[PDB]
Amino acid sequence: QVLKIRRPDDWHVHLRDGDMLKTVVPYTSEIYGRAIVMPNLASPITTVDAAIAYRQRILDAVPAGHDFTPLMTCYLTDSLDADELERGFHEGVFTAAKLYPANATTNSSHGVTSVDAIMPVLERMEKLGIPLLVHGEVTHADVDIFDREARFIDTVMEPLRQRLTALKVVFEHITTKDAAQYVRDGNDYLAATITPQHLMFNRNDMLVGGIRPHLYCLPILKRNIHQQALRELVASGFTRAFLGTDSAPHSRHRKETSCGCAGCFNAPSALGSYAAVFEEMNALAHFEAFCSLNGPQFYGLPMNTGWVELVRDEQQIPGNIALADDSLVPFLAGETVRWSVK
Template sequence: MDRLTIRRPDDWHLHLRDGAMLSLVAPLSADMGRALVMPNLVPPVVTGAQAAAYRDRIVAAGFARPLMTVYLTEGTDPADLIAAHAAGIVTAVKLYPAGATTNSGSGVQRFDAIRPVLEAMEEHGIPLCVHGEVTDPDIDVFDREAAFIDRRLMPMRDAHPDLKITMEHITTVDAAAFVRETGIGATITVQHLMANRNDMLAGGMRPHFYCLPILKRRRHQEALRTLATSGATNVFLGTDSAPHPTHVKEAACCAAGCLTAPIALAAYAQVFDEEGALDCFEGFASLNGPAHYGLPPNEDRVTLHRGDPIAALPALERGETVVTPFDPGRPIRWHVEGNGGC
């Protein structure tokens, strides 16, 4: 198969930032119909009114169909969430363990404190998106996801069996097994399907591969590729595309995140092609996510074709803002028609 037409995909995990960075990166996700936009701004998006204002800024910046999230804190007002979700302003709520990743300092430290919010979300059908890592200093950074499943996610699921949960950007054999066994929703990123920690560390540290959760061993990468391409209906596309200024990535203590949006759809198609699973690609990219969130799939189509490898993309600039797109360091031969060769 050298040509593939599917319903237009959605991105169920996207960072767009704000201000100049927002205006630079928002148009990069034009291949996607909708995108679930993360709320970890500074300060974070914590109310329905703030989510509505941020949505307006995103649309003005060039992405037409953002789906908004609210940042869960220990002071979140359940009534505000219920009203914002009922009004169609907020699609989901994002849980960051405090200190787990970029701009997560306002996240949850005391999980008992958010029980009333989770109970309200469960009752009113408001989905929860989870950054699945513990931040305990005694846990190795490569083991944080597995520890989160045992210490936080399993008890949360037992306490709130009707809460719709998405475990975002899963990275391990442990998470793949948990998702298979429980049927909870899960997203998988471009970089975790296309790379492992050798790509980031062997022969020198490559900061543009650094993200959180961090890339793991090859066996974890292989488990993710198997799950993504298996036809499982609870696993779907979520890039976690996360822009940082180049000087912040190429620093002594570099920021976590990979700007994958410009190549995301082509890269996912490349993975499914390599795994002999192009017949499962539309489900992963276009159907499973809407079904999980109770939305209809997009009606319009997008076409991809196989051709010469995509050239590495140059740095993107808008005024003083410079961002380096992710380069997997291996050929991507699939192209989205009408996307400038990507």
């Protein structure tokens, strides 16, 4: 069987920089028309000039013939000038801005201390129509890791949305039934992205019969009941949830070690993985919208013009993707997948 869809987009991806970038860009560019490129580089993307330079590094690494456009984001920080974000948006450089968890001790050039501290930039985004992408977790030491997303909803997301009622918000990589229900019952200004790992697995898959660092990502995999809620949300054809891989590559040496980094390198296997989930939920009819229509509609962008075909032909995901000095282990490395791109 063949599954033909309009060329999809990836509404949440990390392309890194330098040699990493050169290696990972092709996995996104071959398949996706556009991708929302997250801004969390060593020196975060907090200026139009840096965004332009990063965009060109990305373009330099796209293989010949890939019809790919990187959509850049601004990393919100306490010290960010609202005029810088405005300038970048007005010039087509910034498509959106990303809010990472607040911490009172974060350096002002590297993050936000509180939503209060950046209300002027948020208000400017509301004025201009700039989408706010949110990593919705509280990161206070006394909050259990598994409760961080639910806590954010109540302490940060709801009060923020109640104030900036015309602000477009994407609740990124949702992982709980709490978020699924909040987004489901929300208004037209609220959307969400969902990763392939949060649909395919739960915390047992990461911790039962051994510990699996390649399944370790943030927000952390939750209880089976949460996974079930996310699968049911996409299976329903809900129009405000769309594809965001959160492909977040780290070298093998940084994953398989005493303190492993959070992040699943899923760009090489994500699309076929989502196809598998939709098939298992008897929801293939809703697959195209999730991958290729819902995100564009929410962002006010046109759907892609070309097509991508997936075939139910069993292929094996490589165990390793070579980098210059180390390697990347892809999501589902070594496994035989049911759907592959034609």
